[PDB]
Amino acid sequence: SKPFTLPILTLGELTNSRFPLPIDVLYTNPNESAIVQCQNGRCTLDGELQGTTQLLPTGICAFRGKVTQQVQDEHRGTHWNMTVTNLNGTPFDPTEDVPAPLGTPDFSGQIYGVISQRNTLPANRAHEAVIATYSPKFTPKLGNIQFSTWETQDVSSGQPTKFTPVGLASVDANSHFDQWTLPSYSGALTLNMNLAPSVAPVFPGECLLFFRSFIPLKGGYGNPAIDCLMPQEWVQHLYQESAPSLSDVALVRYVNPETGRTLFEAKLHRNGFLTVARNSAGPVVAPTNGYFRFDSWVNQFYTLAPM
Amino acid sequence: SKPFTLPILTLGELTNSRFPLPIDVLYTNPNESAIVQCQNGRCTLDGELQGTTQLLPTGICAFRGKVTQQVQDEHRGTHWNMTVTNLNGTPFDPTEDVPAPLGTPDFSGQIYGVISQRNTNTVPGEGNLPANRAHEAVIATYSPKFTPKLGNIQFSTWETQDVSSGQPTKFTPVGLASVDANSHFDQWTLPSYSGALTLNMNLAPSVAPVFPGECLLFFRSFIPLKGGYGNPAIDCLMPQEWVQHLYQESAPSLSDVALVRYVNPETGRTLFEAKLHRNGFLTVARNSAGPVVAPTNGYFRFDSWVNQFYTLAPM
């Protein structure tokens, strides 16, 4: 039976699976009231990608498609309707068992990035853009979304278009940033489907352990973060290896390789998430050389050493 | 001896190691006159990173640092100097044996992206949260003010004033600003990392075929443009995932040349074979330039260790 492994990568060698950002810190928040059911960075320990998860770091929160119409906002700015395809350019088939095109953002907010176009030597243009994933017009599962620009005219219809994500536009009240609220992939009156399951601790005194990244802002006040369940390199590694899961919970140890000492241990659950025995919120303070190593398979009743 | 392996990844599951882009096609250009000596996407088969190569896909052509002030420049736009640190935020030590901070761009051009800032100082009335701003920006890597090995670079903005002095600053690369002749795009021309008239150091070595009839094989990506005409590309020697895999495995190289086969897993047939050289690059027996037109399910599989005298089947 092919032994289960994790890559050997410090935090400073990992990237977020929910937005294109380096991992900054490990993080807990036991009092979280929201259901945690993110759709990017979802992979079982035996290498089954779930939700909208795909392998490319460049595909996370990306879109490809073509613009079809300009629609002026009532007050300021300009909106553009965009038909979206799969990231590989093939038509998105809404009958496939996925929530939305792979890579689609998995949270409510105003996602800031750049729209670029290369016409079918060709002409090109790029501009800053914002995608409001809570908008009624955000319907990627139906094959269409809308983005807005500060630029008022120089976006072409019927030409190949790329969205490269950069950060958030705002985290003000009216910008509806909530990293645990899913978009309505087909619009507000329709249920999302084919979702990766929600995740939670099941044992008293445990809480989720996240890989946290701070996300840039176009403007305003804030220090927003995006928390993923596993970094993108772990998704990539599990997919490659596809090791059989020998129980429902792996025990992993966060080790300092210089000293050989274990700093703490965590449960790595079959569906692809970590819990720890910690009763506080905030960053985990740990040496920069540290990383997780698989120890053994255990079960739901295993008691983790407190942090 | 730990067996050598490549990941199992189709072209549509690979990304470029020289710019944050998916791999679009395999590509050859036998009559290339330039010396091929890129500094990102450099890794030996036994896992030794070279040049300015680092592991993060978010680190490629990225910078972290602090704006100092707006500066004068004769060129169009508003210009800003920024100090640069290592990508992990630690001070860049110019005495380390690297050409420049890891992730620094390795080609001449006008790199287009976004500069973003999050202030250090916070406001009590705003919940002790900091102010932020971001704007489109261009870094001309051929500029005499592009001196990353000295810990400083310059970028230009269309925005004329809303960039703050002394505040933490990130550059997120997106594409190129232009490929007109006056924008000096040349993917095989290295920047001068310490400025005009200085010699670069600590470079990963140049790469070339050393067997008649062979040429380099590249993983090509098309790079976005802010404006103007063009369909520019960036060619890497190995995708970022191969750098990441080789670093993980660190398998001993049992000769100077690994034979690999590009396979269609559907039919299990070999489309062509290639040499994967110790220093981290591929050659094939091909006598034309342009894309390699191959099934989308295709990937390289390690076959065996051969040597420099092995003759490849023509593509």
The number of helices, as runs of H, and strands, as runs of E, in chain A is 1, 15
Q: Do A21 and B58 touch (CB under 8 A)?
A: yes
Query: Can you list the domains of chain B with their CATH numbers?
Result: 1-59+178-315 (2.40.510.10), 60-177 (2.40.30.120)
- On whether any CB of chain A is under 8 Å from the CB of B180, the answer is no
When CB atoms are compared, the residue of A59, A87, A217 closest to B132 is: A217
* Backbone region of residue B89 per phi and psi (left: phi > 0; alpha: psi in -120 to 50; beta: other values): left
Residue type, A215: I
Report the first-to-last Cα separation within chain B, whole angstroms: 32
Q: Do B22 and A59 touch (CB under 8 A)?
A: yes
Query: How crowded is residue B294: how many other Cβ atoms within 10 Å of its Cβ?
Result: 15
CA distance linking residue B284 with residue B213, whole number of Å: 8
Say if residues A222 and B132 touch (Cβ distance below 8 Å).
yes
Length of chain B: 315
- On whether any CB of chain B is under 8 Å from the CB of A9, the answer is yes
- On whether any CB of chain B is under 8 Å from the CB of A219, the answer is yes
Query: How crowded is residue A153: how many other Cβ atoms within 10 Å of its Cβ?
Result: 8
Q: How far is A66 from chain B (nearest CA, A)?
A: 15
Backbone phi and psi for residue B120, each to the nearest 5 degrees, phi listed first = -75, -45
When CB atoms are compared, the residue of A22, A112, A288 closest to B56 is: A22
Which A positions 54-93 lie with beta carbon below 8 A of chain B? 55-59, 87-88
- On whether any CB of chain B is under 8 Å from the CB of A216, the answer is yes
Any bridge partners for residue B301, and if so which?
B261
CA distance linking residue B95 with residue B264, whole number of Å: 47
- On whether any CB of chain A is under 8 Å from the CB of B127, the answer is yes
Tell me the chain A residues in contact with residue B224 when contact means C-beta distances shorter than 8 Å: 114, 116, 118, 124, 126, 162, 164
**Closest C-alpha to B185, from B152, B144, B233, B240:** B233
State the best of B132, B159, B185, B240 to mutate against chain A, taking most chain A CBs within 10 Å. B132
3-state helix, strand, coil in chain B (%, to 5): 10, 40, 55
Backbone phi and psi for residue A13, each to the nearest 5 degrees, phi listed first = -120, 15
To the nearest 10°, report the CA torsion of B118, B122, B125, B127: 80
When CB atoms are compared, the residue of B56, B114, B296 closest to A13 is: B56
Tell me the chain B residues in contact with residue A20 when contact means C-beta distances shorter than 8 Å: 20, 57-58
Q: Do B224 and A88 touch (CB under 8 A)?
A: no
Q: How far is A168 from chain B (nearest CA, A)?
A: 10
Q: Taking CA atoms, what residue in A is nearest to B244?
A: A233
What are the residues whose beta carbons fall under 8 Å from the beta carbon of A113, sequence distance 6 or more? A61, A128, A129, A130, A131, A163, A164, A165, A166, A167
**Closest C-alpha to A238, from A20, A10, A44:** A44
Say if residues B80 and B163 touch (Cβ distance below 8 Å).
yes
Q: Do A22 and B244 touch (CB under 8 A)?
A: no
When CB atoms are compared, the residue of A21, A124, A221 closest to B126 is: A221
Q: Do B9 and A55 touch (CB under 8 A)?
A: yes
Helix locations, chain A, DSSP H: 232-241
When CB atoms are compared, the residue of B136, B229, B248 closest to A121 is: B229
- On whether any CB of chain A is under 8 Å from the CB of B126, the answer is yes
Per-residue burial over A189-207, b if 16 or more Cβ lie within 10 Å, else e, is eeeeeebbeebebeeeebb
B241: enclosing H helix or E strand: helix B240-249
Say if residues A36 and A198 touch (Cβ distance below 8 Å).
yes
Q: What is the DSSP letter of A195?
A: P
Tell me the chain A residues in contact with residue B21 when contact means C-beta distances shorter than 8 Å: 58
CA distance linking residue A84 with residue A161, whole number of Å: 9
CA distance linking residue B124 with residue A18, whole number of Å: 30
**Closest C-alpha to A276, from A167, A193, A201:** A201
Q: Do A122 and B224 touch (CB under 8 A)?
A: no
Q: How far is B264 from chain A (nearest CA, A)?
A: 17
Q: Do A218 and B132 touch (CB under 8 A)?
A: yes
Residue B161 tokens read as 């004033």
Q: Do A20 and B57 touch (CB under 8 A)?
A: yes
When CB atoms are compared, the residue of A58, A166, A222 closest to B132 is: A222
Q: Taking CA atoms, what residue in A is nearest to B22?
A: A58
- On whether any CB of chain A is under 8 Å from the CB of B168, the answer is no
Residue A20 tokens read as 């294109």
Say if residues A146 and A152 touch (Cβ distance below 8 Å).
no
Length of chain A: 307
Resolution of the structure in the document, Å = 1.4
CA distance linking residue A199 with residue A70, whole number of Å: 40
Q: What is the DSSP letter of B57?
A: G
Q: Do A222 and B130 touch (CB under 8 A)?
A: yes
